Structure formats: C-alpha cells, structure tokens
Symmetry: D2
Subunit: 348 residues, 4 copies
C-alpha cells in the first residue's frame, strides 16, 4: 500500500468537533501564551515586575472576566499557566471552563538559527512532544499551538528554500503528533512584517509559504478537519510609511487563503502581528463583509486583545475591574468583526 | 525577487470570466473531443463507418440541438471539428456560438509509456503547444483540455512517485502555457477505475494526486481563478461486483476535493469515466444535495451525455430528431443534477 | 542571493582534516555507543549484570587495549562513557587519546513512530543538539553519530515516502548542526535487514534512500568534505535461507554507493547490522579488492568488533587479557579488509 | 513494489560500453551540431553564405580530417548532417566511421520561455523523441544531446526554482527515453556566463543545479553508467574584467562536480561556452593535473575546436588543407589536456 494508516474515527471526530467549536461564529481565540521572557517585554511596557504572583494576577484578571466566553472560544496558555492557580487559589483551567472557554497550550520550544542561513529560524520542540501532549490533554488542553517564523528580504532572497522547507516540516510533524494525542493543532507559519516591501510582495510570499505548508500537512497525514491555521494577514511591511487600507488588506488576505487553503480546514484564526487593536478588528471585519467564506475567518490575538487591558491595569490591583471592561470591549469588537458587524471604535 | 512575474490583469480577467461562464450554475460541459481512433470505438459499438462525413454528421447532430445551451456551457472539440463544417456547410463553431456554447479544444498529443515503469503514462504535447493555443484562440476556442492518466494497483505500487510527478508537471506546464495564450485550462488528472480496489483506496490515491497537482500548479504560477479541474469521481474499482452507493460516492468525492482543492478554483467538472448515463447524473446530483460548496461541482461528460444519443442515432440519418431529443434529456438531467434537483430517470 | 552563507574556512578545514583522519587507510571505527538498554541486551547474551561498574569495566577493557590505534581511528561513545572514568580512575577519553583514537559521541535521542505509519520511525534529538555538541566538543569529541532506521516491506510499501523524507530531513539538520559546532557528522541511514527480500530489492531501496539523503544534505548546506556516511551493506533480507555471496554483497554495495554518493565525501564506514564477525570482515575485504575507490570504504562496527570479545570476557575479570586479544584479532582483520588484504580467519 | 523495472542487461551493457568509449582517455567530443540558425552566426563571423552546399562542405572538411579519431571519440551532429552526403557523395556518418568516431545527434527542439518568468527557458522536444531516437539509431547515432540553459542574476533571483525544476525534469525524461532506445544521453545543463557575478557565485549555482539534475535522473531511473554530463566549467561571469586564473577555474570546477556527481557516471565532457580555444584547453589541462579523478574529465567543444578552423577556411575552398591542420592542432591540444599533458600553445 504505502499510504497513511486510517486515523481513528473516534479521535478524528473529537478533533473535528473541537476545531469547529474553536472556530465558532462570532468568537475567536485569546492568545495568552506569552513565555516568561515575552511577558517581561509586555510588562516592561507598563513597568511591572515579572513575579510569578504578578503573572498569576494578570492571567486571572483575563480569564475571570465575566462573560468573556460570549466572544472567546479558546485561550492559548503557556505551560506555567496551565498548571497555575489564581491568587485566590482557583486553577486557571477552572476559570476557563466556567466560561466554557477551551484551554489550549503552546508546545513549541522556540526558535533556533538554521546553520549557514542569514539568521533564518527553525522551530524546535518535537522531542518529547508526543509525551507532553498526553500530559497537557490530561491537564485539560484540547488544542495546541506551534509558532514558526519567516522573514521577507528580497535582497537576501528571504524566505529561502531551506527556511520554507524547515517551517513546513516542523509544522507538519507537530500537527500529526498533536492529532495522535487528541489535540487540535494550530498551525502558525508567521511571515514577519519586518521590512519595506509592498503588500503584493507579502501576498506572493504568503502564497508560496502556505502552498508548501499545506502540501507538507498532506504528506504527513494531517487531518485538516481537525486543524486550524493561524497565519499573518497580508499587509505592507512595517517600515512602510503608508499602511495599506483595510479594504486592500482584506482583499489580499482572503485571496491568498483562497488560493492555497483547502476548504476542509474549519478555521483561519489570524495573528495580529503588531497591528493596533483597532486595525486588527477593522481588518478582520472587512474580510467578513466579503463573505460568506469556505472557512471561518476569525482571530487568535494576543497584543490586539490585551494592549489596552495592560495599559489600564498598569500593575495596579485596583484597576482590575476597569481592565476587564477594556478586555471585554476588544473581545466584543473582534467577535463582531468575525461576523462582519463591527461598527468601529479583483486584482489577479 | 525570484517569484512569478505578474500575470496581465487583462488576460487574467478574461480567463476568470470565461472559467466562471463555463462553470455556470445549472450547466456543464459536453465532451465531444474524441480523437479519430476513440470515435471509432464509440462508432464501432453501433456499427457505423468512421468517415469524415459521418463524424461531421454526428458532431452537427450534437451541436445543432436546439436549446442545448440551456444546460451546456461549453463543448470540448477535437482539432478536426474545430475547423470543420457541418454537412450543410455551417462551421461547427458557428453552431456552438448560436447556442451561446463556448468552444473548447483538446490540446494534448496522447499518452506514452514512462521508461522503466509498468506501463504508466506520460501525457505528451508541450512542444508547439503555445503556438497551437494562439491558432485555436483565433479559431474561437476559449478553453483547453489536457488528459493525464493514473492507475491504481496496490500490488505494483501504482500510481508510482514517477507517475504522479510526471502527471503534475505536464498539467502545470500545459496550464501555464494555456493561460499565457488566453485559454482557460481544464486540468484532467484521471485516476482510472481499473482494478478491484475499494472506494477508500480511490479516495486516498485521489487525495495524494490532487495534492501534488495543485502544488505543481502553484509552482508554475497557474492562476486558479482562471482554471478548471476535471477529476474522476471517487468510486470503487471497476472490477468490484458491488458499485458504491450514490451517497458514498458523493461523500468521498466531495471530501477528497475539499481536502486538496483551494477554493479560488471556480469549478470542478467531473469526468464520467465509464459510469452509466443515469449513475453519472445521480452521483452529481447527490453531491449537490450536500451543498452549497466552495466551488461549482458540475460535469464534463462524454459517454454519459452521448451513449443513448449514439444508440438512438444508429448511424441512420432519419433518427436525427430522436437522437437530439435523447441528448437533451441527458443534458437536462445533468444540468438539474448540478443544482441538486434531478428527480431520477462523516468518515475521516 | 538566497544561498547558504559561506562556512568558516577554519571550521571547514578542521572538519575535513578530522573526517580524513577517521577514514584513514587501514583503519576504521569501533562503535561502542550502546545505550544503557542496548548494552543490557549485549550483556544479557553472556549473563552479566548491567551495573555502571560493569559498563565502566567493559569500556575500559576495550579502550585500554594496547596497540588498538593501529587499526581503530575513532571510537563512538555513549554520553555516559564520554564523561566516565575507568575502574582505575582514568577518564575514558584519556585512554582513547593515549592510543591516538579520536573520540566520537552518539547524539540522537532514539526513535519514535511517525503518526499514521505502520511503525515507521523518526529519529529524535534536534532539540538542544547544538548546545550538546558544544559541550561534547569541550569534553573531547570530534565526531558525532545519528542513527535513522528504515524497513523494507514490499507488501506494505515500506519504506514509505514519509519515512524517507523524515529520515533525510533529520539527518541533514543534525549534520549541519554538528558542523556548526566543529563535529564531523556520521550520517547513518540504516536500512534494516528484516524480511525475506532479495539483495536486488535491498539495492533498489538503498539507492532511493541515499539519493534522498544526499539531496537533503545539499539542501541543508552540509559540507561533504567534513562528513562521513555509515550505511548498511547491500544484502539479502535476514529471513532468506541463503546468504548472498561475499562477491555479490561487495558488487551491489559498491554499485549502490557509486550511483548515489558524491566523491567529495571522504569515507563510507559500514555498519555490520547483524552479520557475523567474519562475514563483516570478508564483505569489506571483497569491496576493497575491487578498488581503488573514489572514497574510503571502511567499517564502523559494533557487534562485528565486540561479539567474540564479549563471549571471551563472560563478565569474568580474569579473562580481560584474552578478551583484548580477541578484540585485536578482529580490529586487525577489519583494518586489513579496509586494504583488501584480509586472508580470512557487471549487473546494471 | 513501486520501483523502476529492471533495465535490459543487453541494452545497459551497450550504453555503458558506448559511454566509456566516448569518455575515452586522451579523447573528447567534437560538437558540430549547430542548427541552421546557429551555423549562420558562426558563418556570419567569416562572411560565408549559409547554403546547404556550404554546410556540407564545412562538415566534410571537419569529419574527413585525417587522423582526427586519435583525439575525437565522438561527433555531435545536427539532424541535417546525420542524413547528409559530403560534396563528393560520401555520407557524413561514413566519414566518421572511417575514423572510428562515434556519431551523435542533437535531439532537443530548442528553447521556449517558461510563462511568467523573466525570460527563463524550458527545453522542448520530448514529443516524438522516442520515435526519433529509434530512427537516429538506425541511421548510426549512438549518443544524443539535449541542451538546457540557466541564467545567473542575483537581483532577479535567477535561476529560479521553476527554472531549475523544469531543466531537471526535461533532462531526466530525455535521458530515460534515450536509454530506452539504445542512445547514450549527454545531459547538458548549461549555466550561462552572462553577468558580472564572481566564480564563487557560479560555483554555488552549479552545485545547486547539478544536485537537482542528478536527483531527477535518479527519480526517472536513468542509468548513470550509460550517461554523460556536459556542464559549464565554473568561471567568473562574462562581464567581469578579470578572468579567473586557470588554477581557480580548475579548482572550483572539480570541487563542484565532486560535491554533486555520483562516480558511477563515466564522463564529464565540458562545454566551452564562449572561452577562447586556448583557455578551453588550459582549463581542462589544469583539471587533469589535479587527478586522478573518479570520472573522466574531458571536452565536448564546438567553438573551442572550430574557431580558428573557420577563420582559416574563410569559406575559401583552397584553404581546406590549412583549415584541417588547424583543427588537428586544437584536437591534439584538448586530447593532451584530457591527460593533463598539454604544454600550452582548498577552499570550502
Ligand atoms: O504569536 C504567537 C505567540 O504570541 C508567540 O509566543 P512566544 O514569543 O513565546 O513564542
Ligand atoms: O476524458 C477525456 C477524453 O474523452 C479523452 O479523449 P482521448 O481518448 O482522445 O484522449
Ligand atoms: O548502529 C548504531 C548503534 O549501534 C545504535 O545504538 P542505539 O541502539 O543505542 O541507538
Ligand atoms: O552547446 C551546445 C550546442 O552548441 C547548442 O546548439 P544549438 O544552439 O543549436 O541548440
């Protein structure tokens, strides 16, 4: 024969049902999986000491927000948080379950330079991944996340063939391992905005990358019905003085997905990748005005859901109520954007 | 840079508009492009001499059928027919245009064994293809067709890697050449039904083949918005005593497409590949009961539109009216099947 | 540009010089890198308790054999042994250096099933590999080893495409990481002898696998001048009642290498993979009667250098002298075989 | 199974024997296969009318040179010449056979732009190739030639992935078809010298291209024992004011081959690609001073064997003797260069 053995129907059903629950209409993912060093940066921007207690306070602030599950279908956690208790002693997973938010877990081990490239990155973490997935499922996670990173640099030929091949291979292996352990894999091939390239260059690169990713998923026997994609939107580079219009970003982003993503995939959950809170909502809203689409177009936002929540918290306990109000405003905006109903706050 | 140069917006617009016209709701393609030797077989089944006059009579019988354009959006021609006149002196293309049927042209040069394979086939015809496309466009063709063939044989490991790679390469080159010459390419990777394999084996092979085909189309800069796919339905092998149910064929066929075909492609126009006239209609109808779909699911039928028309004609002139009536009955059935409205005549 | 950055000339020179020293005429590698569980098996065959002291005694028995460096250019160690002292307190690396034997280190983390394959194996260990390599170099290792495993099973289509792709990817990543850290990578794609296939089937599979491996090495910017290959010899399957002649094994093995291995690689150091001590020597000798070759054909033997040494030791201290004599007899036989001078003890 | 069927031992033996005869020590190929339009250019440089009679006169001048077979093992012909008679009525093939020179035939149909590339070229000619090969064998050809062309342009990312993939595919198909018809295929992937890139850029590109070519040859079941490679030497771009030294060209050329070409290939027969007659000889001589090599390094020269012969002929009949003397001087120089005996006339 030589083909993939059949996936367990019972496992496949669970994966597909959970992927559709995560990609639920009017809802998206809160990406709260900042590692210890990344959350330091976020905290440094508001001058807060990165104690375990402060991290526990902040994650509890997020996850105990009443009514958050109206707009948030899932929450990506860092490992620490998956096994953490709020300051009041409630396990973080229990706060999520009380809102009906599905817990998810970041499972990559970060980035390492590929030898003899110009600082292009492999994502590490396959070793022990299968055993980690089993433990995380027992702890309550039902989906996973693995971040790969590519750069655009026309003068240096980035992303190089080796970069794309490595990104696709790691994502495909990770996704198949997740599905073997009953976790829905979020496949995150992030093309960074670094540089002064045009939106049309971002579109070309995104198409090449996604074509390679999805071919590799097929090669590794990944069940698209039980997976999710977390791509960059298609935008101008971050060094461009003029940001592309929301209409342009929506057009090129949808076009790049429809040219590469098979429609058995239930959901595309965009990363916000440095965009402002309002841009992230407006760009998603614009895409869902041009629906209906073959897959759900929604959000998996970190900064774009938390930026103002952090600035409102300021590390000050007393600002907890106000901070959660801010988070709800952004969760509502992006849930409405998923439906193409947010009111603000063809090229071949 | 290293990426594909931008396709002409004017050419791309024409290709996309013509592809959508071919994949029009409630309509499909009449495949009337039997070569001289293939039409001999079809004629041998009803005992008719394969004279040029008989071929001209029969193609005129088909294309002059009044009202055919209600259900037929396009007609694939053999080169002879593109430049032929009916017995009454009317160019065949003019009969088509009078019904508003778009003319199309078969442009491959047939099959040749790949060296050191077990009679696995390459499709020939790239040499001079670009110049042929230009002439065919001037003669009135607006779409093309290229047939590749794969076999399932688990004991022999068919289709082999070399078979799939060759099929994908030839289809991608052909499609890019067509689009450079303003012809919509129909991409036909036919997996033959030969053998006693199960429908699930057909499904696995179809997925592997289509994944490879679409990756190659992307590699060769083929515009999916201006292309069409003509695949096999997913069925049991032809040596199986029990034909799969229409519900099963519909489920596995749609599943295989949704797992591999990006939704920028406007249409999937199935070949009937030996099925009976009624099975071809019922299977398509069943797929369009389970819509709406991300692309149009329709037909590009030869035998399944002509079988009874031939048997009613019998080479006898006087049976021309009755023969056209039969053709209209089948065109109507398949147009209705495209809409999921023909009344007869999840596994992961 | 988009190509690999230039490797450091200083690092490349060191790698190339050490690879040529390992592939030195009349010499080969002693593979003494059995993990804790593998050495248990070897010890179980002679009824010896797998204490750390016994492992230290045995490795000291091997490495303190006087005159061993006449025939052994390098010794592959398990991590424990790299940082271990003999029972008398001499570091194992110091015993090696006193004989001028280069220390090497096994750096893979073993095998894991690829999801939805029929128990086909990925090799794990890239995570932390670069940091491990740095530490191992400081501890005295100058080469590394990474074992991948493939199976032949015609009825199951093994090795599958996914198996070969994964094996090649892991070996290429590992090799580039090693070279970035000044370790010569031994690239070991072992096709197991399991099954009843003919030597011609082994030859076909070996060629396909090595073609894929070397293409991946090129893709990952691996310096062939500073690498070594450790392949299976080409033989009948282990279930065959008739073992292939030494002349046949030599012919098909050399043919498979010359059809796939670029001659910039300095050495091919065969694994013995279950062969008897005498067969391993006779097969290598036969290959080097048909020289001179474009690369050194030599040995990296574990069982084929140690089998009789173990049976002579029997865990009994007093048998240490006799055991080392046995080891020297086999080291001499294989060094002589490297030169085509061991006296015993074209098809396209 | 899924692997290539076994090549006929009888056919394989013939191919291997003829490939070794072509790659014979102290000998190389005269490339006299200029098409009608290419020979016009060569003739335009000396002001001669491109009549069939003039072409027949010139090819007869070349092939009737007494003693030419001491240094020329084979002669590549254009189709016209294969079926042509000298002005005196002797078939061209008979002149070759009288000197024991093997006739060869160019079988590609030239170059066509790949759609949506920046004028990157596919080589056409697979259609009817197998039937042409049969006729050419009956006419006396025992080897074939197929030219593919790649460009270096770092700013444009040339050669692009599509260029390399297409070149490799066409060469592999052509080579397998030739071998099925008892013709030794010369595999010619010519990287043009156009541009101002350094020799190290040429080296990197040549390695990438040859790695891809040889992987494709393996994929298509091409017998390396019965094939030949005709690559560019590795040199500075033609816009560079300083030509690389003969020592540099020799070093980088040999290095690029040893890093990519399996040593089962019997011969590498360099194209001269615009070099002067004397540079072509000196560069080859320098490579064969650094032997012995795993394959024969020799020549398949057109301009570098004929330039002075043409200028001495000047279209004037009376200069026939002098012209043949010039040709013999260059044939002798390059035969001596093959042996590293022409007297004039490590970086990782
Ligand atoms: O975009 C995904 C995550 O925010 C990245 O988290 P990380 O920096 O810890 O890998
Ligand atoms: O399925 C497509 C056509 O009916 C095949 O026509 P052909 O046999 O002449 O290639
Ligand atoms: O063939 C190489 C080694 O003997 C394998 O050692 P291992 O079983 O510990 O991976
Ligand atoms: O390098 C090979 C030949 O000289 C090219 O001949 P051609 O220009 O007719 O293709």
């Amino acid at each position: 024969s030589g083909y993939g053995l059949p996936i367990s129907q019972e496992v496949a059903k669970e994966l597909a049902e959970n992927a559709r629950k995560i990609a639920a209409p009017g809802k998206g993912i809160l990406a709260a999986d900042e590692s210890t060093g990344t959350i330091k940066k976020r905290f440094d921007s508001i001058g807060v000491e990165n104690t375990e207690a402060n991290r526990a306070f902040y994650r509890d602030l997020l996850f105990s927000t009443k009514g958050l599950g109206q707009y948030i279908s899932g929450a990506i956690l860092f490992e620490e948080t998956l096994y953490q208790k709020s300051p009041s002693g409630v396990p973080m997973v229990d706060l999520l379950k009380a809102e009906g938010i599905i817990p998810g877990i970041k499972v990559d081990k970060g980035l390492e330079t590929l030898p003899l490239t110009d600082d292009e990155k492999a994502t590490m973490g396959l070793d022990g991944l299968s055993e980690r997935c089993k433990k995380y499922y027992e702890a309550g996670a039902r989906f996973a996340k693995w971040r790969a990173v590519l750069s655009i640099d026309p003068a240096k030929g980035k992303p190089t063939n080796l970069s794309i091949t490595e990104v696709a291979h790691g994502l495909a292996r990770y996704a198949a391992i997740c599905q073997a352990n009953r976790l829905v894999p979020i496949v995150e091939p992030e093309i960074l905005t670094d540089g002064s390239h045009d939106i049309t260059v971002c579109a070309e690169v995104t198409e090449r990358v996604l074509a390679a990713v999805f071919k590799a998923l097929n090669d590794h026997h990944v069940l698209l019905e039980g997976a999710l994609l977390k791509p960059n939107m298609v935008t101008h580079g971050s060094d461009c003085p003029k940001p592309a219009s929301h209409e342009e970003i929506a057009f090129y982003t949808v076009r790049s997905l429809k040219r590469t993503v098979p429609p058995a995939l239930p959901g595309v959950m965009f990363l916000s990748g440095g965009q402002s809170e309002e841009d992230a909502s407006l760009n998603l809203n614009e895409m869902n005005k041009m629906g209906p689409h073959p897959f759900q177009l929604s959000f998996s936002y970190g900064r774009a859901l938390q930026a103002s929540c952090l600035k409102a918290w300021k590390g000050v306990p007393e600002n907890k109520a106000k901070a959660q109000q801010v988070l709800m405003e952004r969760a509502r905006a992006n849930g409405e954007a998923q439906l193409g109903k947010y009111g603000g706050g063809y090229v071949y």
